[PDB]
Amino acid sequence: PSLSKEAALVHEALVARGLETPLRPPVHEMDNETRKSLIAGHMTEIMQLLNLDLADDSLMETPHRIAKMYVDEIFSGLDYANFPKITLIENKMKVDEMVTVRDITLTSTSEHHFVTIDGKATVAYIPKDSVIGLSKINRIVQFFAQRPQVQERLTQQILIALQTLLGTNNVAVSIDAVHYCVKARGIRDATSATTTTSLGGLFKSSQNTRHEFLRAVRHHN
Amino acid sequence: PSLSKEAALVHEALVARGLETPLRPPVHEMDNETRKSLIAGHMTEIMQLLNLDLADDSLMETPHRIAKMYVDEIFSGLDYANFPKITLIENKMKVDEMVTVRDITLTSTSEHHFVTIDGKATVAYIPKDSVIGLSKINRIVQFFAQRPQVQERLTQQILIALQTLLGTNNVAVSIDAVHYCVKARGIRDATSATTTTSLGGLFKSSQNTRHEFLRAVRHHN
Amino acid sequence: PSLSKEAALVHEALVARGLETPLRPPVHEMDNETRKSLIAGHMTEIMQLLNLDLADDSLMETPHRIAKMYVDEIFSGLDYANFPKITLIENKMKVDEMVTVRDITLTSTSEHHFVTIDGKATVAYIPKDSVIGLSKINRIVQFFAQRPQVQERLTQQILIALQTLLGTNNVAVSIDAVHYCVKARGIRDATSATTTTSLGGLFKSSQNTRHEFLRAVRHHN
Amino acid sequence: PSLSKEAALVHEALVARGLETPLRPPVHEMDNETRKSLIAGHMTEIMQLLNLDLADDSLMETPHRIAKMYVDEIFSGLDYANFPKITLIENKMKVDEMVTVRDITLTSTSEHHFVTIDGKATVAYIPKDSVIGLSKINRIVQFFAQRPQVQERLTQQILIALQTLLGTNNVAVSIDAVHYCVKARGIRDATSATTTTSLGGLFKSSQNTRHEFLRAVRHHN
Amino acid sequence: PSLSKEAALVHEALVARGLETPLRPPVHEMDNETRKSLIAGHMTEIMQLLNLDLADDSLMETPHRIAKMYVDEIFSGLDYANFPKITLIENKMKVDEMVTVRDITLTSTSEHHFVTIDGKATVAYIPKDSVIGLSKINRIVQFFAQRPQVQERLTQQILIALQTLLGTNNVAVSIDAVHYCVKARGIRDATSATTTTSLGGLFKSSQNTRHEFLRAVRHHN
Amino acid sequence: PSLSKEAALVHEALVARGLETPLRPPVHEMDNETRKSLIAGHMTEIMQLLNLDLADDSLMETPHRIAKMYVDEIFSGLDYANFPKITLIENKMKVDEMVTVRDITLTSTSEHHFVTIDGKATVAYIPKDSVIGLSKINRIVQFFAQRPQVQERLTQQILIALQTLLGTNNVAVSIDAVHYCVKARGIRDATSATTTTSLGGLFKSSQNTRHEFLRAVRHHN
Amino acid sequence: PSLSKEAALVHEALVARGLETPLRPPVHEMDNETRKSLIAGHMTEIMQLLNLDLADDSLMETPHRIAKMYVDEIFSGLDYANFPKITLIENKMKVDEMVTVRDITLTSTSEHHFVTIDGKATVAYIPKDSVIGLSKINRIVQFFAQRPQVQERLTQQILIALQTLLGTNNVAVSIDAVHYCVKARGIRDATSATTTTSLGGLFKSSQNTRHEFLRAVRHHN
Amino acid sequence: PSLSKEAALVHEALVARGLETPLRPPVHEMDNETRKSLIAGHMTEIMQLLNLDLADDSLMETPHRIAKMYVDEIFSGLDYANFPKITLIENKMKVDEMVTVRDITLTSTSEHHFVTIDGKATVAYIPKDSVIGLSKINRIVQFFAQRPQVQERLTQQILIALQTLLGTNNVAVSIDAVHYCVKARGIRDATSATTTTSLGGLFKSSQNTRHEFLRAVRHHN
Ligand SMILES: Nc1nc2c(ncn2[C@@H]2O[C@H](COP(=O)(O)OP(=O)(O)OP(=O)(O)O)[C@@H](O)[C@H]2O)c(=O)[nH]1
Ligand SMILES: Nc1nc2c(ncn2[C@@H]2O[C@H](COP(=O)(O)OP(=O)(O)OP(=O)(O)O)[C@@H](O)[C@H]2O)c(=O)[nH]1
């Protein structure tokens, strides 16, 4: 009727663990269209406060572009209606070893300064009853990435979403990323990168499994 | 009394050529403090429109951090009071060959989506009466970079600022950058990068000089 | 009233362990202004003893620049009034795995010859009650780096400062650096680099954790 | 009787062109020993002004080490008594093509902040009557490098020193370097590097020769 | 009165273990000057046996250059009068983790063909009562390197010298090198390299420590 | 009857141009066996002068090994009886473009200190009446390399040897090498390398051809 | 009826230019089967002369494998019945710029020692009336590669075959290769590689075109 | 009287373990000269069967070249009269850690198709009573490599040869190689490589030692 069974499931799971992004229920039944126009209005004000000449052919549409970007693009992960369609195939192949999807492109936004987070994620899991379609892992990652994030939370969320959908605790997520709110300003450290990992099931319990995954993490380009 | 002779000079030069960032004069004598609080207010609204729980310990101060960032950090280049102190040494060494400062760290913001532009600039010039202090070239670049930009304009601005301060038309600026408003969203092209160059004096006239510079452009890390 | 609670805490911790930089209390209430002028005075003398023509437009301001650099820049870490503002977010995400910030830019000065130490630090910790703001790790590193150091001590200082602020002994710091007082003169070894690591809590006790961190240390560029 | 014919020649050549380092004649007949003790005295004062505990076993000898380093090591290039012994072999091989010595290690000090300059020089020349001993090129570069420099002047000096000794104007010098007074502090640009070149004779006249040299410049490691 | 305490100690240690370089006591009180002239005499003979025209301006001084090189340069490690001055600082920092100096430039000569051995050493130790000055490790390595060697012995010597000076058995040395008497002639293997390691104390006893070191060995450039 | 026509031709060509290695005719009809024993005798003396214990199982045969190495191996290039067998095939393929053999392994000895020179040569020529067998270029380079050399002369000798054998002046030779008598001792420059080139015929006349060759010079590994 | 029109054309073209592989007409109407058995017979003999135990399970079938390999595989290019099927599409796209197929895998055999030649070819041409199917270029290269070759001839053959088929003289071929009969034995040069190029039409006439191609040659992996 | 004690020992050891190359005793007392002429005869026939014009100046001597190559070069390993001279030095240095010679050039021939095998071997051993001369390891590898091989057997032979000569079972050999009979033809896999390892003594027993060696295996260039 709105949210898919999966979307609902993942959402509840996150809420239960207290890992959901801080959200207040939709204050009023607003069309994304009205929300965008309102956001655009505020951007117009802010741009004017910065003394930008909004009459300039280029600058003129920026409040619109920004409103659209926030609502439809970069923060679309906040709406579970945008949760990807998950397809799982029966594990007839009897795969009992981990499947690793490495170097998943991940672009997020830091909630602290609303500045770009560019990184790559490495997800691995040991198939139980079903094998998830490869692209879905990338889609789920991008879903949670499209929200004002805190890398530490993002990793946790991805882990739970997967554990929930795959029906196994044997999931591990590692994210390596560069925060422009560290690089582009403030301390302006042009070289540092942050790495966060959340291990589930055997990936935490079994040191054998755990290290196999960790060893596999990080691959240049 | 406010702007240094240099700042004034550069500003006028840009205005004269019509290369200045679209700015409307300070509407009213507002303290950066009041501007920030106003910007913060609008951010609070926008964040609320996105349904973010502003009561969350982390999210709570984001409108403040963003306001400060815009005014004091990332868009500080809009205020010529922030123009760097230029120091020039007499060209007693009789340098008659170009001096090239390569891989200058450059972090800017696209004016179209207010999203990160990460790149590197290569500046070169042929000393006439004076030799500019090396760090000043980096400072000037970062100055113009700290504004809502359009790479094509940024390059031009840097070129003119330098030509003005050095007293020679023999200046060349090349900027190679990645736009997150292309990578992180929209067409999401993870590999493309844009390169823009503005050549002045001999760097445009003399094919010999011109190519020497172009050959020198781009160096990994 | 002067030093923040954090600054005070870290300082005391260091003193208690005997890991503080050898300092004599401020002999007399001198303005940094008077200290600088005196330092510059001594530099003038030194430069004269080297037979440098201080009347040269360029050389003329060096004593001033050096005084300023020592007091305000490169040795600012000696004054806890310059300790960074630490911000910690409650560990609601329930992160129980280490967070690693790698390739933190680190530029320090050797106390033995007052010559450049260029390196990179890798800090990792396992969140307990709170998660520290990423940039703060970078800031703290740079703080202790801005002092006449001994790499062996620098590593220890950073370790303790973090353990103190984070409220966990599970912190690990590794610094890889090139000493110009080895490279640029003396034995003039153009290739060697020194690596020092200080491990705390699980990073030292648990060989599993220990090796996970060590394995993660060092990343080119 | 003191300076070698070569040292005298080079010194004069530099003075004639006005390219010598700004030096005041030795004010008084001071032993390097007394100069050092005086320099060490001033360092003791400076360190005390920084509140350093000079009673510390390590810190205790730093003023001595710094005095020795300035006089005997890093600034030894200021004394032509330290000029290298040049050996030239008769060009019987009838070499008429350029000889290029690339990636010559070069460590110098910036005269503006007395901070490290780490770089590499590439020198090339076309043999006329004599061929210089390969290591001598390295020794001459290091000689002029061991002085408070300005890259633009350093390049020039090396060019003239060589033109003088070789008896040909066909000499070219290029230096690519990283200034720690740009990287380690101030604007703290961790990625930029400066490249300066001084071309003599055919290397400037003949575009054919000129480009062959420029093409040959820069080689990683 | 001649050899420093350290030199004497190191020498005795080696002799005791039977790891000293095969040396016969100074047959007669010969000045290095007379030794050099005699060596040069023999070289003159050898060069004449090779039919070289010693009247050639270049060739003429080779016997002198070789004699000086053998006695003063490449084989200077044979005279303990040339042992480096060691400086140790009290381990007040309470460093209990290994300090690793990697990629120490090492150039030696094979005793079998008196041909170049070019390589890099990696030394690591766990501080006990004192911390050695970083450059001293490089100096000790170069000292023993300056002798007609056998890589297997060289590694051993360095290990003992350091254990002796540091007062700890917890020292490890690894040397990776290319032998020109394998590359430049004979089997002419242009790609092979030899790696020898000597482990002491915990580096041998504790597999945990041992592997941490071994893992750390070898770094390109 | 002794020397092949080729050996004789090349030798004469070199002598005519004054590019031969400085050699005195074989003083007396000595067997290489007697020369070797004599050389070994001198090495025994030199080693004794260095206080080496020649009774050591290892050191015991070094004089012999060195004698053999000099006479049979590293300086075998001095005897034209060791000139390679040249094979040329008729240029029926009508090749009128240059053939380039790049990265030819080259190991030589500096005549100034009898120390290793390790480098790589790049030879190219435009076939006229005949095409030389590829390995022969390598063999000729190694021949001349096996002599106490001066890079500048080595390059010239190879050029002439080839022009002579190929019957064309259209030959170009470039050698890039590292001198251990610069690296391993003296100024100890661990990074510099010297490049020398000798161009003949069109490679010197035609800037088109000249630059095509130069462009092709140098290839990593 | 046997050879395709293309095959016949190419063959005749080569014969006309005198660039065909030295072949004597099929002495007698022998089945490849009888030829193979005879070749295998001779190999059996050769292996027995080498004292190999042909009764060994593995060795037993080598003569058969070699015969099949020579006739059917590595020397199949000797039979024009094996010439690839060429497909050309009408140049309706009006392509007037060169099409470059780079890094074409090329494995051939030297006619001098019947040893492996492993390399890569780069072919470029300017479309006139028709555009050739991309894979056809690879197929033609491999065809001529499958014969006992001389790199100088191979390059020529490929050039002509393509000029013939494409109906344009504007074709250029460059082959970079390693000869195991230089590497694996004889002089055993483990690093050298040979590059041969044959330019036709504008690639030879127009220096503009010529250099665009040459610049494009060679790409790692 | 013919074979050295070592050659005899190694040969017997191999035969005893059943690891010798399948050889039939020398059928008749044939001079290598007669074997070569006979081999050449067969090659003449084979070449004629391939329709090659043996009257061609180039092709004319291939039968001879191949015969010489097989007998003297590439298959010389089959004659123990070609076994290298082994020199061992008494392990007075008391080396008790493994010595590893890595990246030993290895060129062999596959016995199945008589096609090139190009690879690199890594040998390591723990000295017992004696230390083998470094080049001897290279020489032994090349010896066994110069035979029609099967990588799996080659590795074993080298292992045994070494264990025998060194008087210890603590030897490990690993070979990584590319088979042109897989690359150049058949399945034509241009990227695969095969790695085979044979471990002896502690390298097999002790997992500690075993993994230290394995970890050390493979180094690019
Ligand atoms: N743990 C964590 N911290 C983050 C993340 N994104 C940003 N931060 C940090 O959260 C903190 C925000 O701190 P504040 O002190 O409130 O803001 P600020 O002073 O403008 O930040 P800085 O100038 O960069 O130190 C900073 O230390 C940020 O770098 C993230 O994903 N995870
Ligand atoms: N042209 C040139 N400039 C140099 C060199 N070394 C340092 N400089 C610059 O010379 C100038 C010194 O400027 P000042 O403004 O007097 O000192 P400063 O303010 O401490 O310098 P910054 O904080 O780095 O901008 C700076 O721009 C230095 O980076 C050099 O070799 N060549």
Ligand SMILES: Nc1nc2c(ncn2[C@@H]2O[C@H](COP(=O)(O)OP(=O)(O)OP(=O)(O)O)[C@@H](O)[C@H]2O)c(=O)[nH]1
């Ligand atoms: N020339 C130029 N274009 C830029 C720069 N920064 C952004 N742009 C582009 O300016 C345009 C904005 O176009 P709009 O069509 O108005 O906005 P948009 O549709 O949201 O943009 P896309 O979804 O990325 O195509 C886009 O094509 C941007 O990628 C810049 O520095 N220079």
Ligand SMILES: Nc1nc2c(ncn2[C@@H]2O[C@H](COP(=O)(O)OP(=O)(O)OP(=O)(O)O)[C@@H](O)[C@H]2O)c(=O)[nH]1
């Ligand atoms: N352990 C340690 N030693 C350092 C550090 N920085 C410098 N050193 C060394 O501390 C020692 C100073 O030794 P001294 O002998 O007192 O001075 P010096 O003789 O001028 O030093 P060298 O000429 O470089 O050997 C040297 O070995 C320095 O390289 C550091 O961070 N840690």
Ligand SMILES: Nc1nc2c(ncn2[C@@H]2O[C@H](COP(=O)(O)OP(=O)(O)OP(=O)(O)O)[C@@H](O)[C@H]2O)c(=O)[nH]1
């Ligand atoms: N273990 C060891 N061997 C070395 C070292 N330097 C040289 N060697 C070897 O010691 C041996 C000398 O052997 P000899 O047979 O006496 O001399 P050689 O025949 O001229 O040597 P090759 O022709 O290279 O095999 C050779 O195997 C050298 O490569 C070293 O540092 N360690």
Ligand SMILES: Nc1nc2c(ncn2[C@@H]2O[C@H](COP(=O)(O)OP(=O)(O)OP(=O)(O)O)[C@@H](O)[C@H]2O)c(=O)[nH]1
């Ligand atoms: N041009 C040239 N010079 C060479 C070559 N090999 C060595 N040399 C140099 O020839 C010169 C010999 O100089 P001397 O001054 O006679 O000997 P030296 O003082 O021991 O040499 P250094 O200590 O290295 O400066 C040195 O500059 C050597 O580095 C070569 O191939 N070509």
Ligand SMILES: Nc1nc2c(ncn2[C@@H]2O[C@H](COP(=O)(O)OP(=O)(O)OP(=O)(O)O)[C@@H](O)[C@H]2O)c(=O)[nH]1
């Ligand atoms: N020009 C050319 N020469 C080749 C080619 N393949 C092999 N050769 C060379 O042709 C020559 C054969 O020379 P020969 O002297 O007849 O045989 P060889 O003595 O066994 O050869 P080497 O021992 O390698 O010098 C050698 O110089 C080979 O390296 C090729 O494609 N082109």
Ligand SMILES: Nc1nc2c(ncn2[C@@H]2O[C@H](COP(=O)(O)OP(=O)(O)OP(=O)(O)O)[C@@H](O)[C@H]2O)c(=O)[nH]1
């Ligand atoms: N294990 C092993 N196999 C090898 C080696 N060299 C070659 N081979 C393989 O031994 C087998 C020979 O197989 P055959 O089927 O008798 O000959 P073939 O059909 O011509 O071989 P392909 O066409 O390459 O599959 C092939 O699979 C070869 O690739 C080696 O060193 N070790």
